[PDB]
Design a protein around this motif. Sequence first.
Motif, PDB file in Angstrom:
ATOM      1  N   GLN A 269     -10.323  -9.035  -0.320  1.00  0.00           N
ATOM      2  CA  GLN A 269      -9.124  -9.252   0.529  1.00  0.00           C
ATOM      3  C   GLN A 269      -9.575 -10.015   1.778  1.00  0.00           C
ATOM      4  O   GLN A 269      -9.008 -11.092   2.044  1.00  0.00           O
ATOM      5  CB  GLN A 269      -8.505  -7.915   0.938  1.00  0.00           C
ATOM      6  CG  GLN A 269      -7.673  -7.259  -0.153  1.00  0.00           C
ATOM      7  CD  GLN A 269      -6.793  -6.174   0.416  1.00  0.00           C
ATOM      8  OE1 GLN A 269      -6.992  -5.713   1.537  1.00  0.00           O
ATOM      9  NE2 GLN A 269      -5.801  -5.761  -0.356  1.00  0.00           N
TER      10      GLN A 269
ATOM     11  N   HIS B 229      -8.683   7.904  -4.221  1.00  0.00           N
ATOM     12  CA  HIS B 229      -8.634   7.708  -5.670  1.00  0.00           C
ATOM     13  C   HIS B 229      -9.658   8.657  -6.283  1.00  0.00           C
ATOM     14  O   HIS B 229     -10.800   8.250  -6.556  1.00  0.00           O
ATOM     15  CB  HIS B 229      -8.929   6.258  -6.048  1.00  0.00           C
ATOM     16  CG  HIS B 229      -7.908   5.280  -5.553  1.00  0.00           C
ATOM     17  ND1 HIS B 229      -6.646   5.657  -5.146  1.00  0.00           N
ATOM     18  CD2 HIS B 229      -7.958   3.934  -5.422  1.00  0.00           C
ATOM     19  CE1 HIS B 229      -5.968   4.587  -4.771  1.00  0.00           C
ATOM     20  NE2 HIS B 229      -6.741   3.529  -4.931  1.00  0.00           N
TER      21      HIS B 229
ATOM     22  N   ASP C  12      -7.904  -1.506  -6.205  1.00  0.00           N
ATOM     23  CA  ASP C  12      -7.118  -1.858  -7.379  1.00  0.00           C
ATOM     24  C   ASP C  12      -7.346  -3.292  -7.845  1.00  0.00           C
ATOM     25  O   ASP C  12      -6.770  -3.691  -8.861  1.00  0.00           O
ATOM     26  CB  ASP C  12      -5.630  -1.652  -7.091  1.00  0.00           C
ATOM     27  CG  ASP C  12      -5.292  -0.207  -6.780  1.00  0.00           C
ATOM     28  OD1 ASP C  12      -5.929   0.694  -7.363  1.00  0.00           O
ATOM     29  OD2 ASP C  12      -4.388   0.026  -5.950  1.00  0.00           O
ATOM     30  N   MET C  13      -8.157  -4.076  -7.134  1.00  0.00           N
ATOM     31  CA  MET C  13      -8.409  -5.462  -7.526  1.00  0.00           C
ATOM     32  C   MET C  13      -9.737  -5.881  -6.912  1.00  0.00           C
ATOM     33  O   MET C  13      -9.816  -6.086  -5.697  1.00  0.00           O
ATOM     34  CB  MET C  13      -7.269  -6.364  -7.064  1.00  0.00           C
ATOM     35  CG  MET C  13      -7.352  -7.811  -7.535  1.00  0.00           C
ATOM     36  SD  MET C  13      -6.618  -8.946  -6.343  1.00  0.00           S
ATOM     37  CE  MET C  13      -7.998  -9.200  -5.231  1.00  0.00           C
TER      38      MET C  13
ATOM     39  N   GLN D 276      -4.210   7.109   3.237  1.00  0.00           N
ATOM     40  CA  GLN D 276      -3.792   7.060   1.839  1.00  0.00           C
ATOM     41  C   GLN D 276      -2.822   5.918   1.561  1.00  0.00           C
ATOM     42  O   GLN D 276      -2.836   5.370   0.453  1.00  0.00           O
ATOM     43  CB  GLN D 276      -3.172   8.404   1.428  1.00  0.00           C
ATOM     44  CG  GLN D 276      -1.650   8.511   1.579  1.00  0.00           C
ATOM     45  CD  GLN D 276      -1.142   9.931   1.426  1.00  0.00           C
ATOM     46  OE1 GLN D 276      -1.920  10.884   1.373  1.00  0.00           O
ATOM     47  NE2 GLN D 276       0.175  10.080   1.352  1.00  0.00           N
ATOM     48  N   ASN D 277      -1.988   5.549   2.529  1.00  0.00           N
ATOM     49  CA  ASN D 277      -1.069   4.432   2.360  1.00  0.00           C
ATOM     50  C   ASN D 277      -1.724   3.080   2.615  1.00  0.00           C
ATOM     51  O   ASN D 277      -1.138   2.052   2.261  1.00  0.00           O
ATOM     52  CB  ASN D 277       0.142   4.591   3.290  1.00  0.00           C
ATOM     53  CG  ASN D 277      -0.243   4.625   4.758  1.00  0.00           C
ATOM     54  OD1 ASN D 277      -0.557   3.596   5.355  1.00  0.00           O
ATOM     55  ND2 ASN D 277      -0.223   5.816   5.347  1.00  0.00           N
ATOM     56  N   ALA D 278      -2.915   3.050   3.218  1.00  0.00           N
ATOM     57  CA  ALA D 278      -3.599   1.785   3.478  1.00  0.00           C
ATOM     58  C   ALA D 278      -5.093   2.086   3.589  1.00  0.00           C
ATOM     59  O   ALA D 278      -5.543   2.606   4.612  1.00  0.00           O
ATOM     60  CB  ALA D 278      -3.068   1.121   4.739  1.00  0.00           C
TER      61      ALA D 278
ATOM     62  N   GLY E 278       0.787  -1.218   0.000  1.00  0.00           N
ATOM     63  CA  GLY E 278       0.000   0.000   0.000  1.00  0.00           C
ATOM     64  C   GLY E 278       0.821   1.270   0.000  1.00  0.00           C
ATOM     65  O   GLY E 278       0.325   2.314  -0.435  1.00  0.00           O
TER      66      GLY E 278
ATOM     67  N   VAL F 280      -6.290  -3.845 -11.761  1.00  0.00           N
ATOM     68  CA  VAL F 280      -7.062  -2.949 -12.620  1.00  0.00           C
ATOM     69  C   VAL F 280      -6.325  -2.635 -13.913  1.00  0.00           C
ATOM     70  O   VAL F 280      -6.957  -2.544 -14.971  1.00  0.00           O
ATOM     71  CB  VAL F 280      -7.441  -1.638 -11.897  1.00  0.00           C
ATOM     72  CG1 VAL F 280      -8.576  -1.884 -10.914  1.00  0.00           C
ATOM     73  CG2 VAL F 280      -6.241  -0.989 -11.193  1.00  0.00           C
TER      74      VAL F 280
ATOM     75  N   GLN G  82     -14.959  -2.356 -13.842  1.00  0.00           N
ATOM     76  CA  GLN G  82     -14.842  -3.610 -13.111  1.00  0.00           C
ATOM     77  C   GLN G  82     -16.121  -3.865 -12.331  1.00  0.00           C
ATOM     78  O   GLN G  82     -16.883  -2.948 -12.022  1.00  0.00           O
ATOM     79  CB  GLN G  82     -13.649  -3.605 -12.151  1.00  0.00           C
ATOM     80  CG  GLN G  82     -12.324  -3.898 -12.813  1.00  0.00           C
ATOM     81  CD  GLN G  82     -11.215  -4.091 -11.805  1.00  0.00           C
ATOM     82  OE1 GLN G  82     -11.372  -3.777 -10.625  1.00  0.00           O
ATOM     83  NE2 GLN G  82     -10.094  -4.637 -12.255  1.00  0.00           N
TER      84      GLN G  82
ATOM     85  N   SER H  41     -11.550  -8.618  -8.169  1.00  0.00           N
ATOM     86  CA  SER H  41     -11.879  -9.967  -8.612  1.00  0.00           C
ATOM     87  C   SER H  41     -12.254 -10.874  -7.448  1.00  0.00           C
ATOM     88  O   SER H  41     -13.093 -11.767  -7.612  1.00  0.00           O
ATOM     89  CB  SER H  41     -10.707 -10.567  -9.387  1.00  0.00           C
ATOM     90  OG  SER H  41     -10.472  -9.847 -10.584  1.00  0.00           O
ATOM     91  N   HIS H  42     -11.646 -10.669  -6.278  1.00  0.00           N
ATOM     92  CA  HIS H  42     -11.956 -11.444  -5.087  1.00  0.00           C
ATOM     93  C   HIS H  42     -11.652 -10.575  -3.875  1.00  0.00           C
ATOM     94  O   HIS H  42     -10.713  -9.768  -3.928  1.00  0.00           O
ATOM     95  CB  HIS H  42     -11.148 -12.742  -5.018  1.00  0.00           C
ATOM     96  CG  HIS H  42      -9.720 -12.587  -5.441  1.00  0.00           C
ATOM     97  ND1 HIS H  42      -9.339 -12.523  -6.764  1.00  0.00           N
ATOM     98  CD2 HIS H  42      -8.582 -12.482  -4.715  1.00  0.00           C
ATOM     99  CE1 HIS H  42      -8.026 -12.384  -6.835  1.00  0.00           C
ATOM    100  NE2 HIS H  42      -7.543 -12.357  -5.606  1.00  0.00           N
TER     101      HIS H  42
ATOM    102  N   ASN I 103      -5.341  -9.970 -12.192  1.00  0.00           N
ATOM    103  CA  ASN I 103      -6.612  -9.403 -11.762  1.00  0.00           C
ATOM    104  C   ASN I 103      -6.513  -7.927 -11.395  1.00  0.00           C
ATOM    105  O   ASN I 103      -7.523  -7.327 -11.018  1.00  0.00           O
ATOM    106  CB  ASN I 103      -7.155 -10.197 -10.573  1.00  0.00           C
ATOM    107  CG  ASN I 103      -7.517 -11.622 -10.942  1.00  0.00           C
ATOM    108  OD1 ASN I 103      -8.348 -11.854 -11.818  1.00  0.00           O
ATOM    109  ND2 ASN I 103      -6.891 -12.584 -10.276  1.00  0.00           N
TER     110      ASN I 103
END
Lengths: 140, 358
Positions: free
Chosen positions: B156, B81, B150-151, B130-132, A35, A113, B108, B153-154, A111
């Motif tokens: 965290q 973001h 950023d992902m 912002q970092n996490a 991150g 972006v 997405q 699909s599944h 996966n």
Amino acid sequence: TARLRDQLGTAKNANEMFRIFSRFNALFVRPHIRGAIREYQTQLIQRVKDDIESLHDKFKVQYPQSQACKMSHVRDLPPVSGSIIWAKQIDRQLTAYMKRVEDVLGKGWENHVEGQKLKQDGDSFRMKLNTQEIFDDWAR
Amino acid sequence: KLSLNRQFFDERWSKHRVVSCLDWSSQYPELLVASYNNNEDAPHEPDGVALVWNMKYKKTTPEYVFHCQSAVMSATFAKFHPNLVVGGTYSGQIVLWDNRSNKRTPVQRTPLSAAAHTHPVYCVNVVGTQNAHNLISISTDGKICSWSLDMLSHPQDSMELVHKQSKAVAVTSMSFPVGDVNNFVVGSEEGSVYTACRHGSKAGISEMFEGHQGPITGIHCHAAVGAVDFSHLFVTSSFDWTVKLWTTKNNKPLYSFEDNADYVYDVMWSPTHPALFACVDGMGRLDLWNLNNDTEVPTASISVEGNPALNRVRWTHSGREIAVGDSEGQIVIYDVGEQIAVPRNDEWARFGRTLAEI
């Protein structure tokens, strides 16, 4: 994370920070470390997109039309094997850039972006780079 | 007093659709995103819509338009973001929209698998620094999933919320404390608010609140932070015509407001004034309550023209404006006066005394 800021405090060109991510690749498996780095990943992903675009542009130029065929004939390499070598080198560079994307984004990049389009383009371009038809035609 | 400042309404997209969620952007306080569900009169049009309006320009057009196949009940901006808009839809697909991309369709969308939401999603919010940061999303089956923006699909992290006897908690809304990331609060259609922990050994529902006698329409934690910390306090609104000010410490209700004569549909704290909060109900009334001045009558009250059912409300980050959306996609913005919204140096102690007295 302070050291990963010193990365940009020291690094100048994109190749050096590419190598830095390559060396520090396992360290980004940690969630906080992953991150921490967010704004540089986009920059390197765009640079890899520029490079794979350059590969696409090079592959648009047909092999006989390219200087590769001429310099392969000059160096005694036969034209069919020269085309095979050209396709294999383009494939190798595609795989190297795919590995660069994996290193920059870390594991699970298919996966991501930004990595989804890169994976799709790489798969299609690798399918187009298949050379077995050339060998079959030459042998026939 | 409340002064009408602006009116937003699109003939093509926002017509004959309810307003499900509102959100103001932290980085862009003059950008407001509004959700709209499917229109029965427009079967050929897209079901879910998300329109982003702007205040700095006086143009009536929606600055950004997004749509998707499933009816959108939730929408918000990603905190860290600024180019992304996250929405929760009827089938549980947590769609995401990039304003840079020319495509209106989501870039997405989470799968409709058991590992993800296969139920409606009314709660999606980004939490962290912002970092996490992580996208927390809750469905009406009680499943709560923390995703990475950023992902998608599944997830965290992901599990099902239960409190007692392994009974599913059908969450309808949620809130987080200011600066807290591990603890949160949820309001379900059971009528029972639950204070829960995200991750840890005690991850899940910690406490139970009996309280309301009907489904909860909204819940909101204390946003104003200053001399006296009131983060433990929150407010809740349900179908039982009652607003309710509670705190985490006291299981029983602290105070209840029943001045409304209809379904009170949501209730939001102010981010600047510690005591002032607002609510909107189904007979067209937006009511501002100032507990420092009066815990007995609304401090101010206004009604939209024609009195349709106001479905959702939202405060701006400065606290000087309040947006409200109703069942026909009509967004109304009211500027709040200085003498009510602006907290004096002694308003925090006034709210402390008001809480002590009750």
